[PDB]
Amino acid sequence: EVPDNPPNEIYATAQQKLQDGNWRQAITQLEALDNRYPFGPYSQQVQLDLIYAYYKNADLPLAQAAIDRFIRLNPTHPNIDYVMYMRGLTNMALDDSALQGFFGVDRSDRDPQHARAAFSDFSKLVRGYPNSQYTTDATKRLVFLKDRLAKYEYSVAEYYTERGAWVAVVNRVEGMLRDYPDTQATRDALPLMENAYRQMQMNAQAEKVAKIIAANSS
Amino acid sequence: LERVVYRPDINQGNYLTANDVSKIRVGMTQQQVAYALGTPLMSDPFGTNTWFYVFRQQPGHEGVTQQTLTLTFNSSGVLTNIDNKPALSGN
Amino acid sequence: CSSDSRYKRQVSGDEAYLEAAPLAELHAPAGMILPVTSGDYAIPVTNGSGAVGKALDIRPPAQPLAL
Amino acid sequence: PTIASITFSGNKSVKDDMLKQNLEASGVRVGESLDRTTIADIEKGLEDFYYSVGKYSASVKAVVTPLPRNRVDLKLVFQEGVSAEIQQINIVGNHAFTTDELISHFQLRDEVPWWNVVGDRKYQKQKLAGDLETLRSYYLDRGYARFNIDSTQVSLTPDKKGIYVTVNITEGDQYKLSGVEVSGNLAGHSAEIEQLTKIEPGELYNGTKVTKMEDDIKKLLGRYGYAYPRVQSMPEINDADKTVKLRVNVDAGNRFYVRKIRFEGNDTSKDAVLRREMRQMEGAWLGSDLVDQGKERLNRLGFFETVDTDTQRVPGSPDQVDVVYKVKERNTLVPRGSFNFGIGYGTESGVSFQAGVQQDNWLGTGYAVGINGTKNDYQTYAELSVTNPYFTVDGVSLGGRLFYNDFQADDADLSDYTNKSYGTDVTLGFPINEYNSLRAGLGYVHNSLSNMQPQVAMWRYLYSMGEHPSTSDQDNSFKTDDFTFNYGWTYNKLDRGYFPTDGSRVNLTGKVTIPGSDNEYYKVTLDTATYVPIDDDHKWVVLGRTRWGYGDGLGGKEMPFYENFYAGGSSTVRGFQSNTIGPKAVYFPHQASNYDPDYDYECATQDGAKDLCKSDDAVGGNAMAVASLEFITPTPFISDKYANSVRTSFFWDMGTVWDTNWDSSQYSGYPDYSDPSNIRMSAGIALQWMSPLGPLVFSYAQPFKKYDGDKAEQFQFNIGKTW
Amino acid sequence: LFNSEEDVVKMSPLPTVENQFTPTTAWSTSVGSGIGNFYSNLHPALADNVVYAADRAGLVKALNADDGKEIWSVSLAEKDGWFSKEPALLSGGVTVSGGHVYIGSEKAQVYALNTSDGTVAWQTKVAGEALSRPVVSDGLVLIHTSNGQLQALNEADGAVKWTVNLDMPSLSLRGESAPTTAFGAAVVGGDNGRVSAVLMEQGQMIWQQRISQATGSTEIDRLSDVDTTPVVVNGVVFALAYNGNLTALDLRSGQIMWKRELGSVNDFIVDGNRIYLVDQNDRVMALTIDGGVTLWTQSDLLHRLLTSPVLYNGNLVVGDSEGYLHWINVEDGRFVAQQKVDSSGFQTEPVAADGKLLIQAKDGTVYSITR
């Protein structure tokens, strides 16, 4: 697959293959440069290149593992901000399983787990490295991804409202009010808790959420 | 609306047998109530020091039974008010 | 294999996250307390002027390279 | 030097994976530092590792080469005498049972018999460390409560290849269960708990029995939501009288509440389509069996290759749990969900093929769409279906389908006509019990026909309707228009995995017209598969499957030929051709109509006789019975048993199709289709393997019994069925 | 396909046939199905011009030691009683004194037959199975077992006088040595790599000494030394190691007299002045009793899975796993003579007395040899 030229030359052809988008051969050459020169001065650089080379070509689980390897072996390094950003972006894109839905399929409630991992890891980034060049992109992603979580929880609260698991409904929507209340999905979800409380007949409780959502008509 | 179909016996909230209920007394602090009934599966989001218990069952398409049991506390979390209602009916 | 041959930075998922939600707030009325906004899911007021992943150079940063 | 490479010669009968791990566990790694001295530590550690895997005779040799920058490649070469073979298994102090009985229960064996080479007698301490408890559990089941493994011993031959193990024991004596006592925080469930516990005081005390009694107590408390009870078992032992007065002591803990139900996985499935398959509700008390019924419903849905449940206690608070249903989706998120393509490719020169989709990831308010399109014979048959199994969240269901069919009878056993039918259904499903369903729906069909060959089995129907085409002719037209009740019923329980192992599935589907329709047959179908795990553990399985059908005219108007039961579909019985079985059609004579002398149209008197003429065409029959008895087995390969779960199975297929309206006295010169006495049997192996499409199946079957009509191909590839 | 990818670490060729003299198989007999697929120590015994052969089915077979003629004989296998008929797994060699012949088994039983008639005189359910040869002492019998326990039994009627635990490792090689009785003391060796001596009563010790060198972390390097019956002359003991080291010792204390390179051994003998030893590499060698100092060493039976040696008719002799016997010189280590006798398997040890050489091969047959 790959020659054992001097490490600077193997790196030069890795660099070039990535810029060419020769992603498969690039990944094989980065893997060979790692294995043949795992402790050398390029090891950190090689780990970052591996992370990108898995993330592009959409080898997402391997990217997530290379990110883990980087943080585990190099918990201090000037571009750890990039590694946590890639933890974020990997877990985020790990929801967007394919393009076939583009003409209307709402994916927001398929699975929370990787969205929630992406959020908490972007949270570590944005809180720890606010001076990063990534920080704005991280924040915009966080806002979207947080509303996406809120949409998933709202989808659960909708389902339970249609089953009438009214304790389940109130407990879910109170969960959304504790966690990420500042979301459009929650602002739409509160009527559904008002209904849940009133179907559960606790009108003296329900009127509080009614007054909250009425005061959030604007 | 409703039809004869196997709605799967949905439980909701908490179990309220009489021997569990009569553990409550107004002197209780929340740390005690939490083992009298088990922890409250419902609580006020809106910041009253209040706990809500429902034992609710729906044994199918027919029959619904519910105890509401509302506990409200002094802000210290020491109980002050108890209300038990078997549910009303209406649509 | 197949590929779009340009703009190797892009998401493989969609760009949409950059527009798909404002940070729409919620404002409880008097007498109510909105429950505590629960830790990690709160996010800062970021600087703002950083780039967005439409145009950010996702190319992994360069270590100093030498032997 | 850095170990810039490591190279392995031999390593037969040990997976390279554990070797790769063991290098790191021995403190050697690719790109680690090395020297010629350290090799002595490396090779003996590998010998130690091989020793640790029972390769006690093994030896290792280590080969070191300088690369041009004096970096080093360490090649490793591996030597064996066929290790850990076992001469004997031996049990001492035993009186109660001859040791052959005991060792028959071990995973270890002493003498792998001429009768069967499956298994082996290579010792492995990991196996023994379990087999000692298989011994202990056998003796406690038989009830020797004072049984002790005394200083168990392993001895290995002065030629290091040989092993034998000696387990010294004191058996004690077998004790009766003269008493059981059960006490504690039972939350009043004693009236059920003791009704697990009922025993005759003369019954044998039994380690298995007390184990299952413990599990059953954990089940009952699970049911009522005491999810994590402390359960303790202690015998009071009267050695002098040699009996156990058993004690079981239970502190139920708190009644756990399900704070959240979490589905992890599901990456294509909308959370709704898992969460609607729950019985146990979030925000309610747990029921362990209710959660298990949720798990079984997720299995029955079949979207998941594995379903796993962790009733995780909530961090930071007692008596609440989250039920994490971890799942892995079948079909690995492939676009267009569950997908259909098929070719019925077999011994036949021509072939049938199919295409389609069904998964509910579709448009609008989130209805499902599923579409199917096929050719068989020169047919075209294609349909749309639109479905919501939860038309509301009770699980009352809607399904409607619109379908078009054309048949052009160029052989393929297709009886000689042009036939078209296009039809709709609208159906509502009620689940009427946890394991059951009912179906009620409108149907419609328009059927129009031309080039109609006079055909006793068809034309007897035609003329019992009236406005028949002329006999002595084939350029012949007919039509019927129909509105119907479509109705059905189901019972489903399957411990499914994806391909089920246990439980029964029954489906019954039928119709009757509205009064005065251009038919007034009633039709009934029943379909079944019952699965059982052999030895009551799910890995080894036997299957029984049956299909049954009837149709008869209500007020006359017998069931039309264009809806008779075909069988010999490779799903229904293998080896028979897709439509071949049962009655074969008998044509009336004509010289020809609309005919090509360069082409073949049977029973043309210019090619054949002038009297009532058989063909090997089949119109199916108005009544049917089918069975398969089927014996399920895995198959190892480089796609090994665990990694791919490929299913394969032997089967005794059986089929009969007949015509309850055959006038055996009138059209008497021919095989009597009034009785099923031409039962058919075929004996077959079928193999099922799964892909971004779905489940492929390769099947082999040839008849055990084959009648003149029984056109067959000894193999056929096929795909899908899906249900 | 795969048959050739499997391996068998080599068992070396047969050495020089040419000889100082030729031996012959003077007589032979069938004894049972026997050691079969099943390695264990079951060498026969000779006294009173009678060979007390015995074989793993449970058959005991006295033979007139000059002839393939027969003397009293029994099977001790379980009387089947409409249950599974179980062979005795007869084991632990054969030993004779006075009124009895004592034989162990791989189950709890040691059986004493009479010397006058074939009936079992006494049977005892000892503590784990009697892998070791029983030994006499004028009124005691002493025994050792798979469970490492030593037992002492009362020679009239088999009651245990005492028991001693000698500890065992995981992955023992036998849990077996015969006790040796000398200068009034027992000496015995146990698979943890220990040798222990007792005062012939009460189970009370003279000593323990521990022979446990190399100390390899892997149990397979550390099967833990002795199984081979230690022996004594002038109260100088000898003990030896499957891996680890041979040593000469005191008996009055347990002090080491000397320690020697000799691991890879399960089998040896001594004489009035010398040690003779066989090996798991199946090297064979001779030493002096003082210091254990090497007299000679040779290796041409490499990996031949040899028997224990014996001094016979002024030579050494050893059995060989392809069925051969090798006669070796006292002082040179040269081969003196060789023969092929068995054809089915032969690592159970030779026995020699009255100028007879006797072996029981595997496949349950005894051969008598003379030179």
The answer to whether residue A54 is domain-embedded is: yes
Beta partners for residue D390, in sequence order: none
The answer to whether residue D369 is domain-embedded is: no
**What residue of A is the nearest CA neighbor of C48?**
A136
Boundary (domain end) residue, out of D119, D153, D170: D170
DSSP assignment string, D562-605: GG-B----TTTSSSB-TT-SS---EEPPBS-SS--TTS--TTBT
E38 touches chain D (CB under 8 A): yes
Name the region of D154 (left: φ>0; alpha: ψ -120 to 50; beta: rest): beta
Give the side-chain half-sphere CA count within 13 A for C25. Answer: 4
Give the side-chain half-sphere CA count within 13 A for D680. Answer: 31
Q: In whole angstroms, how far apart are CA D105 and each of D134, D155, D205?
A: 7, 21, 20
E93 touches E43 (CB < 8 A): yes
Q: How much is the CA Rg of chain A, to the nearest whole Å?
A: 23
Phi and psi, residue D659, nearest 5°: -130, 100
Question: Per residue, what are the HEC states of E93-104?
Answer: EEEEECCEEEEE
Q: Which two tokens stand for residue E44?
A: 């026969």
Q: Quote the DSSP letter at residue C9.
A: T
DSSP assignment string, E254-284: --EEEE-S--S-SEEEE-SSEEEEE-SS--E
Residue E311 CA from chain centroid, whole number: 14
Tell me the C-alpha distance between D145 and D151, whole Å: 18
C32 touches chain B (CB under 8 A): yes
| Strand order, beta sheet including D59-66 | D3-9, D72-79, D59-66
List the one residue out of A124, A144, A150 whose CA is nearest residue A135.
Answer: A124
Phi and psi, residue D272, nearest 5°: -50, -45
Boundary (domain end) residue, out of D227, D251, D275: D251
- Test D87 with E305 for CB contact under 8 angstroms: no
Tell me the C-alpha distance between D646 and D658, whole Å: 36
The boundaries of the domain holding residue A44 are 1-74
DSSP assignment string, A81-123: HHHHHHHHHHHHHTT---STTTTT---TTS-SHHHHHHHHHHH
Chain D partners within 8 Å of E305 (Cβ): 159
End-to-end CA distance of chain B: 11
The answer to whether residue D151 is domain-embedded is: yes
The whole-angstrom distance between B56's CA and the closest CA on chain D is 9
C29 touches chain A (CB under 8 A): yes
Which of D274, D282, D365 to substitute to test the interface with A, most A CBs within 10 Å? D282
Name the region of D571 (left: φ>0; alpha: ψ -120 to 50; beta: rest): alpha
The whole-angstrom distance between C63's CA and the closest CA on chain A is 6
Using CB atoms, pick whichever of C32, C40, C63 lies closest to residue A208. Answer: C32
Q: Quote the DSSP letter at residue A215.
A: T
Using CB atoms, pick whichever of D266, D281, D282 lies closest to residue A110. Answer: D266
The answer to whether residue D285 is domain-embedded is: yes
E240 touches E258 (CB < 8 A): no
End-to-end CA distance of chain C: 36
Tell me the C-alpha distance between A169 and D284, whole Å: 11
D119 touches D112 (CB < 8 A): yes
Chain A partners within 8 Å of B85 (Cβ): 201
Which method, experimentally, gave rise to this model? cryo-EM
- Test B66 with A167 for CB contact under 8 angstroms: no
The whole-angstrom distance between C27's CA and the closest CA on chain A is 7
* CATH code for the domain of D45: 3.10.20.310
- Cβ atoms within 10 A of the Cβ of D227, count? 26
Query: Which CATH number does the domain B10-86 belong to among 3.30.1380, 3.90.1070, 3.40.50, 3.30.1450?
Result: 3.30.1450
- Test A212 with B54 for CB contact under 8 angstroms: no
- Number of domains chain A contains: 1
Tell me the C-alpha distance between D452 and D560, whole Å: 14
A4 touches chain B (CB under 8 A): no
Tell me the C-alpha distance between D581 and D77, whole Å: 62
D576 touches D711 (CB < 8 A): yes
D57 touches chain E (CB under 8 A): yes
D239 touches D299 (CB < 8 A): no
E135 touches E190 (CB < 8 A): no
Tell me the C-alpha distance between D309 and D290, whole Å: 12
Tell me the C-alpha distance between E344 and E322, whole Å: 8
Using CB atoms, pick whichever of A24, A40, A137 lies closest to residue C51. Answer: A137
The answer to whether residue D362 is domain-embedded is: no
- Test B14 with D431 for CB contact under 8 angstroms: no
- Test A155 with D270 for CB contact under 8 angstroms: yes
C19 touches A178 (CB < 8 A): no
Chain B partners within 8 Å of D255 (Cβ): 15, 38
Let me know whether D305 and D185 are in one domain.
no
List the one residue out of E129, E109, E114 whose CA is nearest residue E74.
Answer: E114
B43 touches chain A (CB under 8 A): yes
D488 touches D452 (CB < 8 A): no
- Number of domains chain D contains: 5
Let me know whether D122 and D209 are in one domain.
no
Name the region of E206 (left: φ>0; alpha: ψ -120 to 50; beta: rest): alpha
Angle at A68 between CA D33 and CA D265, to 5 degrees: 135
Which of E79, E168, E220, E223 to substitute to test the interface with D, most D CBs within 10 Å? E220
Q: Which residues contact A57 (CB under 8 A, 6 or more apart)?
A: A23, A24, A27
| Strand order, beta sheet including E351-353 | E24-30, E365-370, E356-360, E351-353
E269 touches E309 (CB < 8 A): yes
Q: Which two tokens stand for residue D593?
A: 């109509």
Burial letters D373-385, b for 16+ CB under 10 A, else e: bbebbebebbbeb
D546 touches D526 (CB < 8 A): yes
**What residue of B is the nearest CA neighbor of C35?**
B45
C41 touches A179 (CB < 8 A): yes
Q: Quote the DSSP letter at residue C30.
A: T
- Report the sign of the C-alpha dihedral through residues E95, E99, E105, E109, in that order: negative
D9 touches chain E (CB under 8 A): no
Q: In whole angstroms, how far apart are CA A157 and each of A160, A161, A165?
A: 5, 6, 9
Q: Which amino acid is at A77?
A: H
Q: How much is the CA Rg of chain C, to the nearest whole Å?
A: 20
Q: Which residues contact A207 (CB under 8 A, 6 or more apart)?
A: none
The answer to whether residue A103 is domain-embedded is: no
Q: Which residues contact E48 (CB under 8 A, 6 or more apart)?
A: E96, E115
Angle at D285 between CA D279 and CA D289, to 5 degrees: 45
Neighbours of chain B (3+ CB pairs under 8 A): A, C, D
3-state DSSP call for residue D69? coil
Q: What's the count of helices (H) and strands (E) in chain D, helices before strands?
A: 10, 31
Q: What residue spans define the domains of chain E?
A: 1-371
D322 touches D259 (CB < 8 A): yes
Boundary (domain end) residue, out of D196, D220, D251: D251
**Neighbour-count burial of D652, counting CB atoms closer than 10 A to its CB (0-12 exposed, 13-18 middle, 19+ buried):** middle
Chain A partners within 8 Å of B54 (Cβ): 166-167, 200
Tell me the C-alpha distance between D588 and D595, whole Å: 16
Beta partners for residue E315, in sequence order: E312
Pairs of residues, one from chain D and one from chain E, whose beta carbons lie less than 8 Å apart: 117
The answer to whether residue A179 is domain-embedded is: no
Beta partners for residue D444, in sequence order: D424, D483
Let me know whether D501 and D529 are in one domain.
yes
Tell me the C-alpha distance between E55 and E45, whole Å: 12
Give the side-chain half-sphere CA count within 13 A for D674. Answer: 10
Tell me the C-alpha distance between D386 and D364, whole Å: 11
Q: Which two tokens stand for residue A34?
A: 């790692």
Tell me the C-alpha distance between E210 and E259, whole Å: 12
Q: Which two tokens stand for residue E17?
A: 């046939």
Let me know whether D134 and D264 are in one domain.
no
Let me know whether D64 and D181 are in one domain.
no
DSSP H helices, chain E, are none
Tell me the C-alpha distance between D288 and D225, whole Å: 7
The boundaries of the domain holding residue D307 are 257-333
* CATH code for the domain of A53: 1.25.40.10
List the one residue out of D477, D467, D464, D375 whose CA is nearest residue D419.
Answer: D477
Q: Which two tokens stand for residue D56?
A: 């006690």
Longest Cα–Cα distance of chain D, Å, equals: 102
D93 touches D170 (CB < 8 A): yes
Tell me the C-alpha distance between D152 and D169, whole Å: 8
- Test A212 with C20 for CB contact under 8 angstroms: no
DSSP H helices, D80-206, are 99-105, 125-142, 190-197
Chain A partners within 8 Å of D30 (Cβ): 35, 38
* Residues belonging to chain B: 91
Longest Cα–Cα distance of chain A, Å, equals: 77
Angle at D653 between CA D648 and CA D656, to 5 degrees: 155
Residue A160 CA from chain centroid, whole number: 26
Using CB atoms, pick whichever of D2, D267, D361 lies closest to residue A111. Answer: D267
Q: In whole angstroms, how far apart are CA E315 and each of D82, E318, E332, E371?
A: 35, 10, 10, 10
Q: In whole angstroms, how far apart are CA D27 and each of D20, D24, D42, E359?
A: 11, 5, 8, 50
Q: In whole angstroms, how far apart are CA E55 and each of D90, E320, E354?
A: 18, 19, 22
The answer to whether residue A183 is domain-embedded is: no
